[PDB]
Design a protein around this ligand. Structure first.
Ligand SMILES: Nc1nc2c(ncn2[C@@H]2O[C@H](COP(=O)(O)OP(=O)(O)OP(=O)(O)O)[C@@H](OP(=O)(O)OP(=O)(O)O)[C@H]2O)c(=O)[nH]1
Ligand SMILES: [K+]
Ligand SMILES: [Mg+2]
Lengths: 180, 186
């Protein structure tokens, strides 16, 4: 039906994707859901299970990998991080747009399962001020749109526009009227 | 090579208000696009100026221009010719400026044939949203990239502006700019 969009935000480490995502979620003009990732790293002071992350053992995470229960996962410095599939599918089926915040290479995994998801790459402003740039540009080929994080407000506006445009796409709007 | 401007095509059914939305778009000083001034054979109306609203032409001259392949597209609407002159569109895109067409649906089909990567926006009546007329309107949108409802002129303008902004952020376009920058530093 009118399933919600899957919106995938990534970019190089330290680019400020968390900060931009937080700005997007402060905007009252839209209402998004957020996929809380699973991790095998230890819970740190102040963190709460099912809020910051779902904290699991390495054996549990690997059992879930085996059962195809992640849209994407990766291992960083000995700890798994990944996106549980069921929350995403259920939330989209309820009509809600859902954001994933993932690391860059994970887009290939997501696209295999959700080829029509909206992939947004957040680029550092050092690209617009201009070797390391080659690596950053190489990362982009997995994504649909590129937004420079020059200022948090401007980046948020650009992303909101991209999402609004996605809701106006003909294939989506056409299907809605056809099915009616 | 040189980064070309986008070709933006606004169309949709008779009487949906393409003219009114286009007019509002070009009253906005933040609008970056260049408007393609069409040729027509219809009579000039009170308040219109030759070379602003349209380039007004005779049927003989318009038909000679058709024969010489001087239109990206032309159509007949209510017994008059309307068409988009070719050189202005090509020159303006080549200078890196986005170009905006406001045209009827038969013309838009011809543009798609020549510019398959142009941005096609279908302006829909709010009657479709409210609840045979609908089916025909849906068939008309098949070639289009986006659908914008003309519920309010200001709202339609804003949706269009966002669509064009989003297309400027497309990775293929952005990736090609950066790949070129990196290459020409060498
Ligand atoms: N193919 C083509 N069409 C053009 C071109 N220029 C203008 N048109 C269309 O020709 C139609 C008539 O234009 P106009 O003569 O200026 O008349 P209008 O202002 O539309 O009032 P009228 O139709 O007489 O009540 C419009 O479609 P609508 O009346 O449906 O628009 P809309 O959605 O705005 O109704 C225009 O979009 C062109 O270069 N090529
Ligand atoms: K026109
Ligand atoms: Mg009209």
């Amino acid at each position: 039906n009118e399933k919600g969009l899957l919106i995938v935000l990534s970019g190089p480490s330290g680019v400020g994707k968390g900060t931009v995502r937080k700005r997007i979620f402060e905007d009252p003009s839209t209402s998004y859901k957020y996929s809380i990732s699973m991790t095998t790293r230890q819970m740190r002071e102040g963190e709460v299970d099912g809020v910051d992350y779902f904290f699991k053992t390495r054996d549990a995470f690997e059992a879930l990998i085996k059962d195809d229960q992640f849209i994407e996962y990766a291992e960083y410095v000995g700890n798994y991080y990944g996106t549980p599939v069921q929350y995403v599918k259920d939330t989209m089926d309820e009509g809600h747009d859902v954001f994933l915040e993932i690391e860059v290479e994970g887009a290939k995994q997501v696209r295999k399962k959700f080829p029509d998801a909206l992939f947004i790459f957040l680029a550092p402003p050092s690209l617009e001020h201009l070797n390391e740039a080659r690596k950053e540009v190489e990362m982009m080929n997995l994504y649909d749109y590129v937004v420079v994080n020059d200022e948090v407000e401007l980046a948020k506006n650009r992303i909101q526009c991209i999402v609004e445009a996605e809701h106006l796409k003909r294939e989506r709007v056409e299907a809605k009227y056809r099915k009616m």
